[PDB]
Write a structure and sequence with these properties.
This is part of a larger assembly, with chains A (70 residues) and B (50 residues).
Chain A lengths: L1 E10 L11 E10 L2 E7 L3 H7 L7 E2 L10
Antiparallel strand pairs in A: 1-2, 1-4, 2-3
Chain B lengths: L1 H28 L21
Classes of the chains: A mainly beta (70), B mainly alpha (50).
Organism (chain B): Saccharomyces cerevisiae (strain ATCC 204508 / S288c) (Baker's yeast)
Family (chain B): Belongs to the VPS72/YL1 family.
Subcellular location (chain B): Nucleus
């Protein structure tokens, strides 16, 4: 849990090629009271981020084993 | 001579017909949205080395 500070997907080589733009991880940086970290989450998080319409400056709640955000 | 001409013409026509049938089947198999952007989700086993 923490305020969202960074939201960047890292491009990686496509196993199937096709000249498309692929992402292997989505990077979320959360800052807290006496604490801050950056997470290399799996690409699946993009659906939950879109559904919860989060933004920079928002504080969010992401379950470690489920992958959902709130 | 004339029959040989007709026979090669018939062979070409038959090859054209069969190839066109195959092409029509392939076009049927390729039914999808034209020139639209597509979002793809892929999961695969990835080999690893130290």
């Amino acid at each position: 849990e923490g305020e969202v500070t960074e939201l960047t997907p890292e491009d990686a080589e496509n196993p199937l090629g096709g000249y498309g733009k692929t992402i292997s991880h989505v990077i979320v940086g959360l800052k807290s009271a006496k604490g801050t970290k950056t997470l290399r989450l799996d690409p699946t998080i993009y659906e939950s981020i879109q559904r919860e319409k989060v933004s920079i400056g928002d504080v969010i709640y992401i379950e470690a084993n489920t992958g959902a955000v709130k | 001579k004339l029959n040989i001409l007709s026979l090669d013409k018939f062979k070409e026509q038959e090859v054209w017909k069969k190839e066109n049938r195959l092409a029509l089947q392939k076009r049927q198999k390729q039914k999808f949205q034209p020139n639209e952007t597509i979002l793809q989700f892929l999961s695969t086993a990835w080999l690893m080395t130290p």
